[PDB]
């Protein structure tokens, strides 16, 4: 995930950490991980970097049930939706044109100019139920 | 909107005020409106009663983009999704089987025991363009 500004070891470290994992996580958890592996990088620095990348769209954003935003470097750059298990944190890339067509149809029927859609599905794995 | 607690003027007042308004609004906005109407009801009371109503299912909850939460009352008791214009705040309820079928298919394919899908979509309405 390239950054608009000059690359620095802190930005490179947070980018390497983002590509290292595949689950959703907020600024605090990733700050904990990077400090523990030996990065020594700031909280506000990672917050600003994540804001910048979200503006660039290289990563995705998702507001949890409480409200805090979590982030994930998705392999697929095209339009897509994520199926997330809160117990595991795993994200599965799922895309469907049916929901997009439905959104466009209802927007046209209501005469709305633009449509921004948030479609999140929260569930639990089969292994989660098992013990 | 019956409340599980005992009959009191606070619950009746907040329920009537919610029924009067048909727009998604935050707790502070509802508190200010109730104060202006002369209810003289507490903000913590508004929060507690609103949480109780949300748990009862008689009201529809929604999370704002920046992080706050807005709430609205919809006459229909059946499950439905909302189109909310951020510019005006007006919300209209709809229902389309396509999202349900896609969620069921995804759950069956991925083996998820249970899923909870949230589909709230945003778009500007006609009057925004009009000047
Ligand atoms: Zn993705
Ligand atoms: Zn989509
Ligand atoms: Zn799981
Ligand atoms: Zn509703
Ligand atoms: Zn509008
Ligand atoms: Zn649905």
Automatic annotation (TrEMBL), chains A, B:
GO terms for molecular function: DNA-binding transcription factor activity; DNA-binding transcription repressor activity; transcription cis-regulatory region binding; zinc ion binding. Binds 1 Mn(2+) or Fe(2+) ion per subunit. Zn(2+) 1 binds at residues 60, 74, 80, 82, 93. GO terms for biological process: negative regulation of DNA-templated transcription; regulation of secondary metabolite biosynthetic process. GO terms for cellular component: cytosol; protein-DNA complex. The keyword Ribosomal protein does not apply. Keywords: Cytoplasm, DNA-binding, Iron, Metal-binding, Repressor, Transcription, Transcription regulation, Zinc. Homodimer. This is Zinc uptake regulation protein.
């Amino acid at each position: 995930p390239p950054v608009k500004g000059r690359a620095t070891r802190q930005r490179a470290a947070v980018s390497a950490a983002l590509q290292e994992v595949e689950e959703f996580r907020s600024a605090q958890e990733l700050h904990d991980m990077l400090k523990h592996k030996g990065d020594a990088v700031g909280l506000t620095t990672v917050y600003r970097t994540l804001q910048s990348l979200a503006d660039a769209g290289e990563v995705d954003v998702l507001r949890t049930a409480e409200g805090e935003s979590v982030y994930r470097r998705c392999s697929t750059g095209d339009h897509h939706h994520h199926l997330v298990c809160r117990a595991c944190g795993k994200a599965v890339e799922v895309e469907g044109p049916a929901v997009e067509k439905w959104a466009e149809a209802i927007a046209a029927e209501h005469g709305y100019v633009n449509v921004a859609h948030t479609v999140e599905i929260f569930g639990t794995c089969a292994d989660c139920a098992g013990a």
